[PDB]
Amino acid sequence: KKSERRLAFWLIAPAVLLMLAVTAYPIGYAVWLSLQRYNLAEPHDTEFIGLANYVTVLTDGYWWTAFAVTLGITVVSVAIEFALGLALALVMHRTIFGKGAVRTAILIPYGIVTVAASYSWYYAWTPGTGYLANLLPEGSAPLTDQLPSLAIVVLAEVWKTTPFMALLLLAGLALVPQDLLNAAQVDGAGPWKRLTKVILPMIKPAILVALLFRTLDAFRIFDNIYILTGGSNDTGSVSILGYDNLFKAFNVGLGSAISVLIFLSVAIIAFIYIKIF
């Protein structure tokens, strides 16, 4: 009937008029700002310009560095994230002891604020204040160098983002009926030849959705790198690059250029992932 569709459209109206507005009008204003040049110190020189900002950021030399940094971080974080999340999901499902304690402990880092975790990993790896910096050669300072800092960021990111991967994998892995596993065991499949034959290729959609979400989430990391290294020592990500540019150079042109480029990179990654899902 028409009344049912009217009711559905009325219930849908607020959600969509908020989503589309706050998601599309800002990005449209962003591309329109990128087509111009600004300066937050003098908003009077608003003369129009071409695509000079795009070819400026793309060929400056410091945009591809941040791009490579964030791609390295997202790949070497999503790999570990998937491995550890599968392990933790198998733990949370197949356990004989009190699973309530395990699930509560695993939920604790899921909801914790991403600034307490980062100020924990900052004062752990600090030489003289924490322990993970004393369990090293003296005067190591594993946070004022390029690759040690990338490693600390990857560790914090894995510890923080693993619980939701584990919960998604458990949501997928709790649908596998026990009759399937019993039949696989009766046929001859061992412990591992059951996994990668009846339970791993069976939850394909759960793994794919969780992996896409975790990739597009790790592609935008700002907190860990902001309050763990500060973007200095050339270990700044892409989000930190855009934020630093806009809020310490007051150049809205390059800021919005980098913004649109980040959105386009995320779109390209998502489209490739759906193409080779």
Binding site: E4, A8, L11, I12, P14, A15, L18, M19, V22, T23, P26, I27, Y29, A30, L33, V91, T95, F97, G98, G100, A101, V102, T104, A105, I106, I108, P109, G111, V113, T114, V115, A116, Y119, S120, Y123, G128, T129, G130, Y131, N134, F164, L167, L168, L170, A171, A174, L175, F213, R220, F222, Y226, I227, S239, Y243, G255, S256, S259, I262, F263, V266
Partner: protein, 273 residues
């Protein structure tokens, strides 16, 4: 048999340690005074509240916690009502368009925030909506809608289907049928969606750090990140760890009380029991 018992007793302790080491580090770092700040995770020196009695001295962190609680409550209320509308729409009735709405409700879930706060910080600099509770509730309830829709569509597909007919066959007007047969059946869903949306919208750092500038409407994570150059200088370690602990306590409370339903809501109602 002892092999499997030991291997299940050493894998749960492993998980709990993995999950509670970098939180107990915050705790043991914030409890110690400005002495013996050297190594030691087992609280080397005696515990004295020489940091908590300093962080709460002034309008530095108390206001930044009040703004956080208020913003979080407003955003969870509004996002839960809007996501409940959308979830009951995409849960039972809407035929024409129930496949691209769940695509937008993922595009904005995987939306890079920095791809959005470069224009907004300009736009919301002209309207005058720079640093006020309106000016943070809008993006918070924008990005908190997918979580609510997910965890509420779960519980909305959970409840059975013949209840509406069994209500209208007894004489119930559709309004009466709804408010007396479905409303009390969707209260757990709404409370768990509120818990989840609060836990989410209560930790966003990029938005609050980009938009807010003054002591009015400045969230707590931004205050913690600003403890470096603020008055609080008896040593930044104690104050920062104290703020981090005061922050992370509500999540500990929420999980310890409602994990049974938080797991069942996050896993889309698949590990109920």
């Amino acid at each position: 048999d002892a092999r499997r018992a030991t291997w299940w007793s050493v894998v749960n302790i492993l998980v709990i340690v993995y999950a509670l080491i970098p939180v107990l580090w915050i705790l043991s770092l914030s409890l110690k005074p400005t002495s013996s700040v050297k190594d030691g995770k087992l609280i080397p020196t005696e515990i004295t509240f020489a940091n908590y009695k300093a962080i709460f001295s002034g309008d530095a962190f108390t206001s930044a916690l009040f703004n956080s609680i208020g913003i979080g409550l407003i955003t969870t209320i509004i996002a839960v009502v809007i996501g409940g509308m959308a979830a009951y729409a995409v849960a039972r009735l809407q035929f024409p368009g129930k496949q691209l709405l769940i695509g937008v409700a993922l595009l904005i879930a995987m939306f890079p925030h920095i791809s959005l706060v470069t224009p907004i910080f300009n736009m919301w600099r002209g309207i005058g909506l720079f640093d006020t509770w309106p000016g943070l509730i809008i993006p918070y309830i924008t990005f908190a809608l997918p979580l609510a829709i997910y965890t509420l569509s779960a519980f909305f597909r959970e409840i059975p289907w013949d209840l509406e007919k069994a209500a209208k066959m007894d004489g119930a007007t559709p309004a009466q049928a709804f408010r007396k047969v479905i409303a009390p059946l969707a209260a757990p869903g709404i409370v768990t969606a509120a818990i989840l949306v609060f836990i989410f919208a209560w930790n966003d750092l990029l938005l609050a750090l980009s938009l807010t500038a003054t002591q009015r409407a400045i969230t707590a994570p931004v205050a913690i990140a600003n403890f470096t150059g603020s008055s609080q200088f008896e040593e930044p370690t104690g104050s920062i760890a104290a703020g981090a602990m005061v922050i992370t306590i509500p999540i500990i409370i929420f999980v310890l009380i409602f994990q049974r339903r938080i797991v069942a809501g996050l896993t889309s109602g698949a590990v109920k029991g």
